[PDB]
Ligand binder design. Structure first.
Ligand SMILES: *C(=O)/C=C/c1ccc(O)cc1
Length: 122
């Protein structure tokens, strides 16, 4: 399945973490407060993060401080609150990694209590 698909959450809902590693784009699943539930192979190839070492940590506080801003983290909380997280925008990842421009797609998961952050290079 492709990045930005209109029903991407349906497709990923039925995938085990083994299949998540096969996606063409980065995929991070977070709970309502931003804690990392899943972190696929594609994302680690972009950021250099070891899934083993980031799963369980908080994305906005510990792992990705540059995303702790109104336009990323702020948008995330608004979507968690409204129950309708679904937005795509461009961003630059630069903490402990070479500055990398990406396109981000945040979307609520089907469980309704977990959320997706999808990433691809631009
Ligand atoms: C900005 O500091 C972003 C850091 C970051 C983004 C996404 C990741 O998967 C890991 C680190």
């Amino acid at each position: 399945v492709a990045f930005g698909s209109e029903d991407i959450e349906n497709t990923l809902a039925k995938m085990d973490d083994g299949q998540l590693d096969g996606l063409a784009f980065g995929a991070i699943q977070l709970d309502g407060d931003g804690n990392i539930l899943q972190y696929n192979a594609a994302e680690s190839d972009i950021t250099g993060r070891d899934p083993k070492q980031v799963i369980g940590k908080n994305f906005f506080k510990d792992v990705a401080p540059c995303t702790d801003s109104p336009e990323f983290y702020g948008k995330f909380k608004e979507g968690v609150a409204s129950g309708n997280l679904n937005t795509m925008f461009e961003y630059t990842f630069d903490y402990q990694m070479t500055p990398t421009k990406v396109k981000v797609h945040m979307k609520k998961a089907l469980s309704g209590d977990s959320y997706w952050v999808f990433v691809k290079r631009v």
